[PDB]
From a paper:
Human D-2-[name] is a member of the 2-hydroxy acid dehydrogenase subfamily of the VAO/PCMH flavoprotein family. Regardless of their promiscuous metabolic origins, D-2-HG and L-2-HG can be converted back to 2-OG by two [name] enzymes in humans, namely D-2-HG and L-2-HG dehydrogenases (D-2-[name] and L-2-[name]). Like other members of the VAO/PCMH flavoprotein family, D-2-[name] is comprised of two major domains named the FAD-binding domain and the substrate-binding domain supplemented with a small C-terminal domain. The active site resides at the interface of the FAD-binding domain and the substrate-binding domain, and consists of the FAD-binding site and the substrate-binding site.
Residue numbers in the entry:
A (entry chain B): 53 to 519
B (entry chain A): 54 to 519
Write the structure that this text describes.
């Protein structure tokens, strides 16, 4: 397995130092450390003996100062919803939680610029800005637990990426505490600013290996006057692809989401979450969201789109909603697939960028390659962005199934010049499969960046660069 | 200010470059005159060698040689940059991307364009528009600027309000590092979270961390309907309320919101012989929309104009959808900087400020300089909080400079603003970044420069503080 690097260990003197630095924010009880030591998938468990819960940036600076002097490894943690083992310790790394860094600093009701602490929960920020007629530029099924700082650190994609784009575009600024405790102020709450290198970009998607994000400045789109959702059954993946093409051609700028899922996804959400399907049974389903300023115009656009889709046989059955309750019910069928999967058994999870025309090939292939050894195989996800969520469920983990899946899936993906981690990132699980998507020289430059910014390697060791 | 201890180009270096780039070694002093002078004609180098590589490998071998020989290199694109970054200070070798102008691929479904860094922006716009796509950025310099220079400077421009930053729209880069190492981050994927987003370091790095040789970029679909409204507003309060109403009533179809004052209109009319299409007003607003249903857009515009004219925010306005008149109206805005450079010496500031006080500095400067300036103008990308502030004089005055600087930068800092929103830093602004950046940021910038280019051969005297 992996070998523990020669870090120090937490002493009683370290515990007293942390008690000084963050009064009331030191958790040492072994039973309390159980939950923060286990990842969301429940397949990785750390042995951390101390949880720190600072409230302020200065406390994070001082914690890291101490850990730097003492050579203590630190595991940053947000909502602990990450999918790649990046969020929990491997050995006895200190868990530094942002749970209590949950304050909004300011919100400007004209520019739409939000500034908040890294540990603000995404759904709560959404409620906050929606009260002021804005929205968050990203959303995901983990919204109820994930922290904005986690989202920035993982460069989270999500359900409205197609409309508002990457955090690399929507993050306006960051405050980041470096491994030695230096507070890096890149908190430029300005729409535009070309005064030197865009240092904050290094910390977007770096998963806590280059520094700990403590404050975020983010551009919030205006809240749309009109939101529509359509949920459609398609008789094959070719019709899904043509439905996408037609959807872009007829809805255009009002399109805010395009998600697909297969029949098995629908069956699992129905069986485990008791969610009835609102359309006729089909081998594929598509959820489309639109967001716009004029309800009448959006309705005309959608009506004509539906007319054409049903006319040319791209869609066999479809339903539409504007009522918030019904919209949420329809969205639940897509958002909760991952939960139903984790309720179905042990989950093998792959998050791939592929040519959209070939997005589903791997699922049919794996259904053939695997047999009754797979309990289920599913494909779903962000088709508009070329992003497939591939999942295999089984009664239990088995080495034989892992050996059938890997490296086969990663070589198929490399054969398509795809990404073996479209959005979930690298972390612990994928640290040794980056060669399928990144050339050696890039990986080396990444290693040099790590050495420059964290020469002691105390920030999230065993991740997210190759060994 | 003072020349760093770089080597000097010998006859053997010339013979090596002739081996590396046959046909691409320019040493004629008269041919070297134009590439040594920046667009503003206020900086002029003494470079004696211009290199014009064709391929990425030629660039790699050139930089390998310069690394072994400790020769400074000045990358140059279209040479339209505004901050003295694009021309040597002394005798840096000018490496031009002029011949690196081929498109490599374009995926007719994803809209992803892969092209060499020296492709001119206008030409790329033509290419992708022939295929029903558009570039995610546009600039007044479109006719000359290179996509490599746009990425190196993180160019903003006239459709930034709709499509946003190159940090979002650039999908991949091939970069040649100072020692010749070719860094391949030339992915063509919409989403790829397999490690650090290294390409981001080179977007806005102004050639100090590496030479961009290949760009992969996401082109938005070409709009079915483009509309432009050119409106006259009786004051800046009404400009700001017009902006708010525009966002409320046009929404997602909005693709541009630009403003200019009366003096800008007078200067473009005088020097460029472009007549105003609207009544004389203290302020003018150019609104562009882009949409998929021309009728819905036209209806939105109708209701917007009716409301704006009815509530007194706009006094008189003209709209255009014909491509020719659209380009005429856009020309009234795009060529202001040229009319200014024909009015005499130009003091140029590019500031990010709170939109609600975007114009306050123009009024302040007009009171502060009164008759010692020829003109003070404010215009630009109001939707993005970005003011272009220009002062013209019949000739340069150290007096007027002392009146403008540091005052303007201090004012900006007082607004927690940016002293260079878009155009960047280059040579001109290397020592005024402290008004927008704290010392720890600038130090980390210097550490990255030292990691990527320890000899400092790439673009010396830029773009970090002295
Ligand atoms: C139901 C569900 C749906 C999801 N949907 C999506 C989706 O649509 N798109 C998508 O991209 N992902 C999705 N995810 C996974 C996604 O990575 C997480 O939901 C989220 O982005 C991470 O937030 P977090 O606070 O839980 O981070 P954590 O899991 O706590 O940590 C993530 C990583 O970043 C580091 N980190 C955390 N906080 C900080 C910080 N403040 N500073 C520095 N480093 C830090 C951690 O060390 C770790 O390596 C989903 C997950 C679930 C469970
Ligand atoms: C009329 C006019 C209008 C303009 N409008 C705008 C506007 O709306 N928005 C805006 O942001 N800017 C605008 N600009 C200025 C803008 O910075 C440049 O026009 C544009 O960004 C491209 O510059 P360029 O291709 O000429 O690069 P150059 O001027 O040749 O170079 C600019 C800088 O980038 C570096 N560089 C160039 N090519 C490369 C390369 N391949 N690799 C690495 N480094 C490189 C150079 O060393 C230099 O430091 C305008 C300029 C003019 C003259
Ligand atoms: O669990 C998964 O594979 C996908 C989860 C998440 O990224 C989603 O978009 O639903
Ligand atoms: O020269 C200027 O002040 C601004 C130039 C350019 O960014 C423009 O938008 O006109
Ligand atoms: Zn996802
Ligand atoms: Zn500009």
């Amino acid at each position: 397995p992996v070998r523990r690097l020669p870090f120090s260990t937490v002493s009683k003197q370290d515990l007293a130092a942390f008690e000084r630095i963050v009064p009331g924010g030191v958790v040492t009880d072994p039973e309390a450390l159980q939950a923060p030591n286990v990842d969301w998938l429940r397949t990785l468990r750390g042995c951390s003996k101390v949880l720190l819960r600072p409230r302020t940036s200065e406390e994070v600076s001082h914690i890291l100062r101490h850990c730097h002097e003492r050579n203590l490894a630190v595991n940053p943690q947000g909502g602990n919803t990450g999918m790649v083992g990046g969020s929990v310790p491997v050995f006895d790394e200190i868990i530094l939680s942002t749970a209590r860094m949950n304050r909004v600093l300011s919100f400007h009701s004209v520019s739409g610029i939000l500034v908040c602490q890294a540990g603000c929960v995404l759904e709560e920020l959404s409620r906050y800005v929606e009260e002021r007629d804005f929205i968050m530029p990203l959303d995901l099924g983990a919204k109820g637990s994930c922290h904005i700082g986690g989202n920035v650190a993982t460069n989270a994609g999500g359900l409205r990426f197609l409309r508002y784009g990457s955090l690399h575009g929507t993050v306006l600024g960051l405050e980041v505490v470096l491994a030695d405790g230096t507070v890096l102020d890149c908190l430029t709450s300005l729409r535009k600013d070309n005064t030197g290198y865009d240092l904050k970009q290094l910390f977007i998607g770096s998963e806590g290996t280059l520094g700990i994000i403590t404050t975020v400045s983010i551009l919030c789109p205006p809240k749309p006057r009109a939101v529509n959702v359509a949920f459609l059954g398609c008789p094959g993946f070719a019709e899904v692809l043509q439905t996408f093409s037609t959807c872009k051609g007829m809805l255009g700028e009002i399109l805010s989401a395009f998600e697909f899922m297969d029949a098995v996804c629908m069956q699992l959400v129905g069986r485990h979450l008791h969610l009835a399907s609102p359309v006729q049974e089909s081998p594929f389903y598509v959820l489309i969201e639109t967001s716009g300023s004029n309800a009448g115009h959006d309705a005309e656009k959608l009506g004509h789109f539906l007319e054409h889709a049903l006319g040319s046989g791209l869609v066999t059955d479809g339903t539409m909603a504007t009522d918030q309750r019904k919209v949420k019910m329809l969205w639940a069928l897509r958002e909760r697939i991952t939960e139903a999967l984790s309720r179905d058994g042990y989950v093998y999870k792959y998050d791939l960028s592929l040519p959209v025309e070939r997005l589903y090939d791997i699922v049919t292939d794996l259904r053939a390659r695997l047999g009754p050894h797979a309990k289920h195989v599913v494909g779903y996800g962000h088709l508009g962005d070329g992003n497939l969520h591939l999942n295999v469920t089984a009664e239990a983990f088995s080495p034989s199934l892992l050996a059938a899946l890997e490296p086969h899936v990663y070589e198929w993906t490399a054969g398509q010049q795809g990404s073996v981690s479209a959005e979930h990132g690298v972390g612990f699980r994928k640290r040794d499969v980056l060669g399928y998507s990144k050339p050696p020289g890039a990986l080396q430059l990444m290693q040099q960046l790590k050495a420059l910014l964290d020469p002691k390697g105390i920030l999230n060791p065993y991740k997210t660069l190759p060994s």
